[PDB]
Amino acid sequence: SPAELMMLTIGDVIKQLIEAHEQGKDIDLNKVKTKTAAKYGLSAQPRLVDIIAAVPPQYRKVLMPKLKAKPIRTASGIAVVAVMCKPHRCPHISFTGNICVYCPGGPDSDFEYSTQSYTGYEPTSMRAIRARYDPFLQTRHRIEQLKQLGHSVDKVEFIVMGGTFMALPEEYRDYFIRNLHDALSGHTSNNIYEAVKYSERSLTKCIGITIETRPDYCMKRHLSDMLTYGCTRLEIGVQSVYEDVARDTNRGHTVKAVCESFHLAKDSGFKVVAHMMPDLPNVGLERDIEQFTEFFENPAFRPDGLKLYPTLVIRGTGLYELWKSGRYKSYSPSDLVELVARILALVPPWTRVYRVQRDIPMPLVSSGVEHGNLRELALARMKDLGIQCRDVRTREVGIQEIHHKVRPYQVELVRRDYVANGGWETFLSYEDPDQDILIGLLRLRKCSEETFRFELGGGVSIVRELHVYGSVVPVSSRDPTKFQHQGFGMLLMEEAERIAREEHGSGKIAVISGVGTRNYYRKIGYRLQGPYMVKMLK
Amino acid sequence: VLETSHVFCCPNRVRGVLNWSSGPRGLLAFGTSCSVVLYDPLKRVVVTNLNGHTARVNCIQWICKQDGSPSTELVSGGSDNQVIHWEIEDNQLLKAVHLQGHEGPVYAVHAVYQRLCTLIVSAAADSAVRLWSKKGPEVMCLQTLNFGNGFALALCLSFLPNTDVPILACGNDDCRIHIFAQQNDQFQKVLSLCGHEDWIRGVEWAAFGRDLFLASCSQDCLIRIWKLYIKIRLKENTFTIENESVKIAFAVTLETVLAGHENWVNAVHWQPVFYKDGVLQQPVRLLSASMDKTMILWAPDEESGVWLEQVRVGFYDCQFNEDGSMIIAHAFHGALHLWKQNTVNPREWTPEIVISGHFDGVQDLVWDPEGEFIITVGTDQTTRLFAPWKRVTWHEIARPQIHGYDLKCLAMINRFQFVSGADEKVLRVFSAPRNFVENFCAITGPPTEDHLLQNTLWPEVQKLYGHGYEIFCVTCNSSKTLLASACKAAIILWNTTSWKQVQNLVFHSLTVTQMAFSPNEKFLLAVSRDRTWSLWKKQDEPVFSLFAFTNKITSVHSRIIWSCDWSPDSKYFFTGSRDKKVVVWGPCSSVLDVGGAVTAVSVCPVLHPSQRYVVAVGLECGKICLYTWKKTTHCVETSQSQSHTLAIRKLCWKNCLHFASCGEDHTVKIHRVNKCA
Ligand SMILES: CCNC(=O)CCNC(=O)[C@H](O)C(C)(C)COP(=O)(O)OP(=O)(O)OC[C@H]1O[C@@H](n2cnc3c(N)ncnc32)[C@H](O)[C@@H]1OP(=O)(O)O
Ligand SMILES: C[C@H]1O[C@@H](n2cnc3c(N)ncnc32)[C@H](O)[C@@H]1O
Ligand code: MET
Ligand code: SF4
């Protein structure tokens, strides 16, 4: 059998490389791959997955630095895990049989198993289908699969899929959340609070969750509810900056409610990511440019997280027939490239882009662009125009090194501030300006005069979030060279505290945190109060 | 005059919910929703149940019998800060003691038969532990202790060698062990073990001669073994303890470090000692269990300083037999695996039959017309069929389908055909595949755990639509001609062969609750959630003009109806509702109140020549009382042993005594009564 022959080649490679390691000899993996394949009469190269699949642990301890696959999965600095909710119905349908004019198949839209705004062919979708949407099974399977690639899971985070979450029966969501927390804790519980207390002392060190929603479920009741879950960031879906479009799109709400939702959430202390929807009906190209410029020029919005999704006519929706009637037309691909290139030149430095384009399978869209890759095309176009972008994701150390191999040389501090939703926002960072490469960031502001949480009443400044990018470093490990444990955060904390004490003129500092991360602040003398970590300022 | 016949269930999911009595013919004990179950492996029959604790039972614990005889005492710790002792006798209970003081759920228990003032230690979820003296009826909490934070997870008691001095080792979540000695009548923190770095997932003593070895199934994916003894070489940790003015010195140090698993190690069990015809050997067989479906029975050798592993055949625990020939474990969920060693080869093992259940909760069931097999459906998104087995003991034989969404409706069609209702707007129709039919007819003229799910699938023949929302009820007529179904505000009726609409009724305002085909196929009763009922009369596909109905006032019940049933000759119908009201119908009887919320009601298929109609009523608190009302009365009710702990769901009867008890405790109990009674 050939299979045992490849196995023998694998063992040969293993012994050669461990021998090289013992004396510290350096060898090209591909070279020995080729030589072993030739000397054993192999017609095809060996897969690296199987190469990792046989190392003994007393060597996996140190061989991973030369064995990890697709390092970009940790090139940010934090592991990411996605989970799927049970399919259900959106609330608005209470009026008529309208989900959204552009939304894909929902619970009952000619799909055996699917979800609202999801065809059902995403790898996450098949994972959920096999898992029968069970949280625990799918999360264990996914984390195991990720660890197969020899990646540290010291710090992890959770993102939840699904159409709508706030609009679900409470007992179900509590069951779901406690199952998630028990997945990392390994301790069977009975309520949310028990799972919280147990996960406090776990070692997986969860650092937060983010959920999608819509402005209807944005009153302070739901915010307090989410405070009990440790959620950090939120998704809304804006789709426009013009009220008329909403009723044109049958969205079923007002942009105003979105604006007050933004203001209230920012006052509370969460983070928010918006969704932008270019090339819409009754929208000219100049309309798109103007509205996108407005999206940052207005102090009303000035959001933090940005996501973009170009229009995609798909069978089943009303827009399918509208285009089919030859009345809704898209742009040429060059037009889209120019649009994106212009947009990227406009992003303020603090904002971070997370994704571009949808992940829908190709042979389904009546106007789907050929290119699965668009950011690269935009990059080519903006090289052609000789104008650069300043997105966070494009100036962190991880991506910049993995795509250009540039080493920071002189890192310094930088401070900026602006106004948004009435807030006195403030942004701090360490970064190297000459290469414009960034390492660490912090977002801190003064709380608004009107608030929902009385714990913030008077002399209180909230620090929304703090983060240093890079790659995962185990909490016990100190220096694999790199930049994740040099004490950088300490300086930012002390300086932010000093600013709040003097410039803010407050009297007590509060902060949101992940369930595990609380212990970190304990090292600085921060004590708990409700769901908020806090320190007295006098 | 009611006697239990068969019970089907599964243990809970949390760790440490199974145990064996250490005496010969060791009985098997495991927890459930709120009760406890005693079961034997000899004839593979549940011994009995204990309907005690009122929460998710967390951890059970047998009692040590130093003489080497079957145990008769038990310790249970449940989910609401309640720990119960149990005095077993002749397969029954004498009395139970309900210790109080804990706040959070209790998950660590250990009791020692002192050498009676038995000793109890129990750590609850409130970062605290308590110590209790039990001398006969006298019970008290000897001591209470707590930590700064975190929790303890590992608890096991011990005596100092060659004396009665008691000593405890506790494993908290702080990656180290703590020890306590009861000198001066009080347990004193003596030492700590700074071993591996993870949560402690279990500790086990083993008295080997003069010395005492220790096992630690750690979460750190490692195993470390120390040993206590009496007082170039390393630095061992020793101390002196007071004992009748004698400072006896004891020394402990590491013995070995074993590592053969990948995921977390959950449970370890020493080989229990037993008699070689009065010969008390001290074996060193050890058992291990981990997450990654791996059994390793470690063992040393004549010179094996590092213990030698053995057959790795193979989910939080694996229990071990007295002699060691048997061995058992539970799956991650639902079923469980049972292996036995074979004499021919020391490396030989064979799986063995074990009972199971829906392990979450059952919502519907059915009686086959022939009377040899019953089909049930639960919230586990499964379906199961049960039939008696010969050699008589009933056993689950098939799992016809597994469904993505939950299933909550069921109806019968023909000899192998049925229809189920789920969380969708669809109706599915199943018929038995041939292979299953021949395999069944062979048995009637022993499926294993894993072969079942591989080869118990069924085909689908139909797919029905029409309801604007998820289905909520389903039923079929006796003559097998039409069926009734309703979602959460219309009625849709389907022909059998055509599978198409026959007539649609939109009469009620709120959600439908239950249907009832008239036994003589002359009417169709409908009870809904709007405190009203409807009756529709078939004409000479005859239409179903409303023969009679009720308004908001003519209705007798003041709250939501739940159940309805006809008369054997369709003379009268009977309704039960949450307002604990019982009525007979026009109405011809007084309110037959019972003081408990009505969840289910059913009638005898045949009537006595005395015309004394009898009725079975399933209440909301697990109690099952029965009454009788001839045209113008309590007869017998269920025992404490024969009572559920949750609301009843359906009470169907045998037809050609016996009936069905489909509780919410994910248990299927069958009860027989005297034919004459
Ligand atoms: C709030 C939820 N979001 C996140 O947590 C984002 C991910 N967080 C991180 O990657 C890191 O915590 C940071 C972004 C703060 C970078 O770490 P930073 O360089 O600032 O830490 P410092 O160098 O200033 O201090 C080092 C100490 O932090 C400790 N530490 C690292 N991670 C954690 C953690 N989750 N919880 C508690 N302590 C931690 C280290 O053990 C180290 O202690 P040591 O004295 O034994 O070395
Ligand atoms: C997730 C974000 O993408 C939008 N969205 C969801 N599905 C589609 C689609 N087929 N086409 C365009 N936008 C879509 C949502 O309305 C939300 O704004
Ligand atoms: C997945 S669509 C975006 C989130 C949410 N369904 C909304 O429209 O508000
Ligand atoms: S609210 Fe969002 S998920 Fe729901 S139908 Fe509209 S676009 Fe789709």
Swiss-Prot record, chain A:
One of its GO terms (molecular function) is 4 iron, 4 sulfur cluster binding. Expressed in the cerebellum and spinal motor neurons. CDD domains: Radical_SAM. Tyrosine-phosphorylated; phosphorylation on Tyr-193 does not affect elongator complex integrity or ELP3 protein stability. Also serine/threonine-phosphorylated. Residues 73-363 form the Radical SAM core domain. The modification N6-methyllysine is found at residue 220. GO terms for cellular component: cytoplasm; cytosol; elongator holoenzyme complex; nucleolus; nucleus. InterPro entries: Acyl_CoA_acyltransferase, ELP3, ELP3-like, ELP3-like_N, Elp3/MiaA/NifB-like_rSAM, GNAT_dom, Radical_SAM_C, rSAM. Its EC number is 2.3.1.311. The modification Phosphoserine is found at residue 152. It holds the Pfam family Radical_SAM_C. Pathway: tRNA modification; 5-methoxycarbonylmethyl-2-thiouridine-tRNA biosynthesis. [4Fe-4S] cluster binds at residues 90, 100, 103. Gene3D superfamilies: 3.40.630.30. Catalytic tRNA acetyltransferase subunit of the elongator complex which is required for multiple tRNA modifications, including mcm5U (5-methoxycarbonylmethyl uridine), mcm5s2U (5-methoxycarbonylmethyl-2-thiouridine), and ncm5U (5-carbamoylmethyl uridine). In the elongator complex, acts as a tRNA uridine(34) acetyltransferase by mediating formation of carboxymethyluridine in the wobble base at position 34 in tRNAs. This is Elongator complex protein 3.
UniProtKB/Swiss-Prot annotation, chain B:
Changing residue 531 to A: No effect on interaction with ELP1 or ELP3. Transmembrane segments: none annotated. It is found in: Cytoplasm; Nucleus. It comes from the Eukaryota. One of its GO terms (molecular function) is protein kinase binding. CDD domains: WD40 (cd00200). GO terms for cellular component: cytoplasm; cytosol; elongator holoenzyme complex; nucleoplasm; transcription elongation factor complex. Changing residue 529 to A: No effect on interaction with ELP1 or ELP3. WD repeats lie at residues 9-49, 52-96, 101-142, 148-190, 195-231, 260-308, 315-349, 357-391, 402-440, 466-504, 507-540, 556-585, 587-628, 643-677. SUPFAM superfamilies: WD40 repeat-like (SSF50978). InterPro entries: Elp2 (IPR037289), WD40/YVTN_repeat-like_dom_sf (IPR015943), WD40_repeat_dom_sf (IPR036322), WD40_rpt (IPR001680). Keywords: Cytoplasm, Disease variant, Intellectual disability, Nucleus, Repeat, tRNA processing, WD repeat. Disulfide bonds: none annotated. Pfam families: WD40 (PF00400). Folds into a two seven-bladed beta-propeller structure which is required for elongator complex assembly. It is linked to Intellectual developmental disorder, autosomal recessive 58: A disorder characterized by significantly below average general intellectual functioning associated with impairments in adaptive behavior and manifested during the developmental period. MRT58 transmission pattern is consistent with autosomal recessive inheritance. Component of the elongator complex which consists of ELP1, ELP2, ELP3, ELP4, ELP5 and ELP6. Interacts with STAT3 and JAKs. Belongs to the WD repeat ELP2 family. This is Elongator complex protein 2. It comes from Homo sapiens (Human). The gene is ELP2.
